[PDB]
Design a protein around this ligand. Sequence first.
Ligand SMILES: *[C@@H]1O[C@H](CO)[C@@H](O[C@@H]2O[C@H](CO)[C@@H](O)[C@H](O[C@@H]3O[C@H](CO)[C@@H](O)[C@H](O)[C@@H]3O)[C@H]2NC(C)=O)[C@H](O)[C@H]1NC(C)=O
Ligand SMILES: *[C@@H]1O[C@H](CO)[C@@H](O[C@@H]2O[C@H](CO)[C@@H](O[C@@H]3O[C@H](CO)[C@@H](O)[C@H](O)[C@@H]3O)[C@H](O)[C@H]2NC(C)=O)[C@H](O)[C@H]1NC(C)=O
Ligand SMILES: *[C@@H]1O[C@H](CO)[C@@H](O[C@@H]2O[C@H](CO)[C@@H](O[C@@H]3O[C@H](CO)[C@@H](O)[C@H](O)[C@@H]3O)[C@H](O)[C@H]2NC(C)=O)[C@H](O)[C@H]1NC(C)=O
Ligand SMILES: *[C@@H]1O[C@H](CO)[C@@H](O)[C@H](O)[C@H]1NC(C)=O
Ligand SMILES: *[C@@H]1O[C@H](CO)[C@@H](O)[C@H](O)[C@H]1NC(C)=O
Ligand SMILES: *[C@@H]1O[C@H](CO)[C@@H](O)[C@H](O)[C@H]1NC(C)=O
Ligand SMILES: *[C@@H]1O[C@H](CO)[C@@H](O)[C@H](O)[C@H]1NC(C)=O
Ligand SMILES: *[C@@H]1O[C@H](CO)[C@@H](O)[C@H](O)[C@H]1NC(C)=O
Ligand SMILES: *[C@@H]1O[C@H](CO)[C@@H](O)[C@H](O)[C@H]1NC(C)=O
Ligand SMILES: *[C@@H]1O[C@H](CO)[C@@H](O)[C@H](O)[C@H]1NC(C)=O
Ligand SMILES: *[C@@H]1O[C@H](CO)[C@@H](O)[C@H](O)[C@H]1NC(C)=O
Ligand SMILES: [Ca+2]
Lengths: 851, 103
Amino acid sequence: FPSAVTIKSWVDKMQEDLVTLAKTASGVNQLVDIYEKYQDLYTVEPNNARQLVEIAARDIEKLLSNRSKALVRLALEAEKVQAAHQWREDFASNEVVYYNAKDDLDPEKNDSEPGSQRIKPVFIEDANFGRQISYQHAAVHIPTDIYEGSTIVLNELNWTSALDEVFKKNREEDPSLLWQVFGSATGLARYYPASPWVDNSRTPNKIDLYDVRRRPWYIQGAASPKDMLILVDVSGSVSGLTLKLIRTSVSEMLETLSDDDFVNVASFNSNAQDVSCFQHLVQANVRNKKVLKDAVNNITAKGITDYKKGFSFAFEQLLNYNVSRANCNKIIMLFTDGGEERAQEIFNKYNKDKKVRVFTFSVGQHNYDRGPIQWMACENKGYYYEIPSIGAIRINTQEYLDVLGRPMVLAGDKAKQVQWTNVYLDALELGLVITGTLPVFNITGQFENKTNLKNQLILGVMGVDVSLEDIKRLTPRFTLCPNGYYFAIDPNGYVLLHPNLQPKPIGVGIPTQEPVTLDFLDAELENDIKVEIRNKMIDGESGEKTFRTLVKSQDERYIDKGNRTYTWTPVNGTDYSLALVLPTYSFYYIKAKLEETITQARYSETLKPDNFEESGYTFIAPRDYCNDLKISDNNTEFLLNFNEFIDRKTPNNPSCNADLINRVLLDAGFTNELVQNYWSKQKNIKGVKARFVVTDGGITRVYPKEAGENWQENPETYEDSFYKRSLDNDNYVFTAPYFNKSGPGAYESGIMVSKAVEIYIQGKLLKPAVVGIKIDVNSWIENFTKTSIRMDCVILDDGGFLLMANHDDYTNQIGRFFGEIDPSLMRHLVNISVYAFNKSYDYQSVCEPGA
Amino acid sequence: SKQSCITEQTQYFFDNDSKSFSGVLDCGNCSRIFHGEKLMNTNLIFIMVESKGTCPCDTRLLIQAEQTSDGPNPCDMVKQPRYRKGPDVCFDNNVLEDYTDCG
Ligand SMILES: *[C@@H]1O[C@H](CO)[C@@H](O[C@@H]2O[C@H](CO)[C@@H](O)[C@H](O[C@@H]3O[C@H](CO)[C@@H](O)[C@H](O)[C@@H]3O)[C@H]2NC(C)=O)[C@H](O)[C@H]1NC(C)=O
Ligand SMILES: *[C@@H]1O[C@H](CO)[C@@H](O[C@@H]2O[C@H](CO)[C@@H](O[C@@H]3O[C@H](CO)[C@@H](O)[C@H](O)[C@@H]3O)[C@H](O)[C@H]2NC(C)=O)[C@H](O)[C@H]1NC(C)=O
Ligand SMILES: *[C@@H]1O[C@H](CO)[C@@H](O[C@@H]2O[C@H](CO)[C@@H](O[C@@H]3O[C@H](CO)[C@@H](O)[C@H](O)[C@@H]3O)[C@H](O)[C@H]2NC(C)=O)[C@H](O)[C@H]1NC(C)=O
Ligand SMILES: *[C@@H]1O[C@H](CO)[C@@H](O)[C@H](O)[C@H]1NC(C)=O
Ligand SMILES: *[C@@H]1O[C@H](CO)[C@@H](O)[C@H](O)[C@H]1NC(C)=O
Ligand SMILES: *[C@@H]1O[C@H](CO)[C@@H](O)[C@H](O)[C@H]1NC(C)=O
Ligand SMILES: *[C@@H]1O[C@H](CO)[C@@H](O)[C@H](O)[C@H]1NC(C)=O
Ligand SMILES: *[C@@H]1O[C@H](CO)[C@@H](O)[C@H](O)[C@H]1NC(C)=O
Ligand SMILES: *[C@@H]1O[C@H](CO)[C@@H](O)[C@H](O)[C@H]1NC(C)=O
Ligand SMILES: *[C@@H]1O[C@H](CO)[C@@H](O)[C@H](O)[C@H]1NC(C)=O
Ligand SMILES: *[C@@H]1O[C@H](CO)[C@@H](O)[C@H](O)[C@H]1NC(C)=O
Ligand SMILES: [Ca+2]
């Protein structure tokens, strides 16, 4: 064992070698020299986080209020038109002409129905929606279980063409509008841009179970948040088929619950108990609903029934205010079959002034008495449903929603307020969308007051989609450092907008049409300061907080000790709350001032893909440089099209922004001026294998053009893990190569080493770019093997990854986690506390189907 | 084909700001001598362990990867759930309502 000072001097020699090699090969201080030399070609502008947050918040408020006004217009016309409609039963002569979304594109005349003449639309291609769209009329969706020729359906198809006119007039005023739809309470959906149904026109293996009345936005707009307590009745007599139908009914009833509704499931047979590990009304989010479903599927039927011991449990659980609740619409759902016990005493004692409704379901095909079951609903504000077979499972839950919306209607115009939905995936594919909903009331008898037979129900729910890509354009991130971003939040904490929110359904457990509700604390690394910031944001108040965080890297393999500043403000007139995360070195940025009309050209000619030997191999970040440019994954096509659209740019003054184009051209100029005046003059170094630089503007030239063929980093510099990593640490960072990744590997690629530029402009610190060296592994192992070999002197980084060893066999598994080889070493090391760690969950990650 | 799935993931980082860490690893019935030196002005560490071919202490492994797992115990995070603000206004229990429609 060599003495401490000996190997300490070894470390000093090797570290000075590495530092000198990196700072001489990459060209850190020379690029700094360029950047400070050209203070005249740009001006440093501040990122006043308060101003940016307020600006983006009021832009998002303006967007949401635009869609709210569209909803108001649609609901006004729907109510007014239906109030002036006269019933019929004779549609053979008076055709109802409409497009049925589930139709055949072939010109087949015999696809029509007796009472209605179908439209054959002309479908154009729109990249705003990504499908076939015809803006001349609105399609209609009619569930497969509902006949499209009955009288109710035909009357609904009649009074909803004024909706066609108002849809068109809404889109004319706001050309950016996505789906706007009337979800009718008879099963119809009438969405404006006429497109074929998403994937189930007529296709095998593919049955269309869509029903608008079961969608999250309809269920949201059709009533107010609930407090359900499903009383399953698992006694002896419900065993067999009745129990299978009861558990299917309970699952399909939990499916009609939002994140604002609270639910628990109890089961009673001569004594009542919960079915799950919960003992109080728990929130009906994805994970709790899954737990309740898994507990209900494990339920067994045995014993006599005591209705009083079950209803006592139900009411006593609905009177528990020590827990968080939706103090509204208290409900009891009784999933029995039938009996001879009205239990008038228990209702008299517990539910006297009738605060709690009671919905009674007679599940099963049987012949027991349904008298008490029909009575319990009457005396207690409820409704009585019958579920005799699978196929009647799916409508009676929709129907209890129909019942709950009476007091919402009786409060005439206080109830007509726009509500925005959690982030779900659109039925007709456009990814993550939120939708505003407005209920549409029945106005037939008004100011000539009549009987009001069914004037307590709603007609349906209006709904207009807002896409999360429509919101990400109101929060531009390209004036920030890559570590900075925007993010928003519900009052439930779920992130409406977040860089860690990806189009994909949220996982709920280990594998054997739900909203993507990713909580804020589950999208980042949770602190105790961040919990405070979340609770401050949810309360809808403004603030600011700078502190030291733990920022997991973009590649999910490292952690940095970041330094962030969370500024936030509420989005006015909405339940959301916007926040802007911003590093301390990100309070200033570069505004490229290139207005000579010839300087931009004298920087632009250098990007052409023919000069790839005077300059390096470049990639262009696929941004919205402008509308004519269409981004692709074939990056060389994007570089080409970018060059042509540079060629004739002067006429495109009101077309596309000077900011991004000038910034990228200036970054190309600075990168080229370094590849020329510091790398081309030298042309080769022994230790290195690839000298590259990345920039926040999008310019990422790599010198040899041959190792750039081994460059798989993302062209979008704002999405490279190593770049955002190098911004944080004010030193050189070694990005360990990915072990056992079929591709450029390590030997023929190298190991990334990078450092961030640290210029000062009028005393303002900036980090515009990160120069990186792909150090060749062979020269470095040669320089390392001038040391002791055989026992093992290893090199590890943040995250404990194996850069190399002296063993000459570990280097074969270069880039592996050191724990995969000799775990005892770094388990001990963790206990010395040289290595901390953090375990966090990724609820939104794909997973192999287990057994 | 593939299904969504909670996957617990781990990351490691230098906890302390010190530069030199030495000791002897307490392997099963054996001793392993090591010295960890953190290279200055970089993110690299030099672990100078002097023990190879000795008794195996590789009882388990530290797998830093996206390993399939169940999520947090949802029966525990309903006792002290995160802060959450419900909708301000809701409509129930209207007296003009017509209860004569049970079915
Ligand atoms: C392992 O191989 C050699 C040393 O065995 C490393 O290169 C040498 O690094 C030392 C660092 O102390 C330099 O002095 C050597 O020359 C220097 O080169 C720079 C280049 O700008 C000059 O400015 C200096 O004045 C000096 O001449 C350097 N040798 C060469 C030929 O460049 C090598 O980097 C190392 N391998 C790795 C991967 O680090
Ligand atoms: C909104 O409410 C109005 C009434 O409040 C509904 O209109 C009424 O609908 C009922 C049932 O569809 C009609 O009763 C039927 O009348 C025909 C002919 O008289 C008869 O053959 C049937 O047996 C049945 O009795 C009623 O006439 C009609 N109008 C009025 C003034 O009551 C309307 O349907 C509701 N909106 C929706 C979308 O359903
Ligand atoms: C994620 O990793 C971080 C690493 O920073 C962990 O935070 C650290 O956790 C340890 C263990 O709980 C804390 O040690 C204790 O700190 C208190 C107060 O500082 C001290 O009085 C105790 O004697 C003990 O040393 C440490 O302070 C804490 N660091 C910070 C900055 O809070 C964290 O626990 C890991 N896990 C999660 C879920 O975040
Ligand atoms: C929201 O409105 C309040 C008062 O109406 C105002 O003080 C605040 O600045 C507004 N917020 C934004 C982001 O405009
Ligand atoms: C809101 O609608 C108006 C139509 O008068 C439109 O000009 C404006 O651009 C819209 N605002 C946003 C943020 O889309
Ligand atoms: C209802 O049908 C009649 C007969 O075709 C038609 O004249 C009337 O315009 C329809 N109602 C609406 C609101 O379009
Ligand atoms: C849940 O299923 C397990 C496995 O069969 C069973 O042992 C247990 O009794 C079930 N739970 C209840 C409450 O019956
Ligand atoms: C709720 O809290 C009160 C007061 O702390 C307590 O008396 C009661 O036992 C608790 N539980 C229920 C179910 O009310
Ligand atoms: C930001 O970084 C500096 C130096 O890295 C540190 O002194 C400061 O405390 C950090 N900010 C906060 C809020 O801790
Ligand atoms: C992308 O397309 C361009 C032109 O179509 C072609 O030159 C290039 O090789 C393609 N690259 C990939 C990775 O497909
Ligand atoms: C270190 O190892 C001891 C002995 O195995 C163990 O009890 C302890 O929990 C470990 N960690 C710390 C921080 O002491
Ligand atoms: Ca029974």
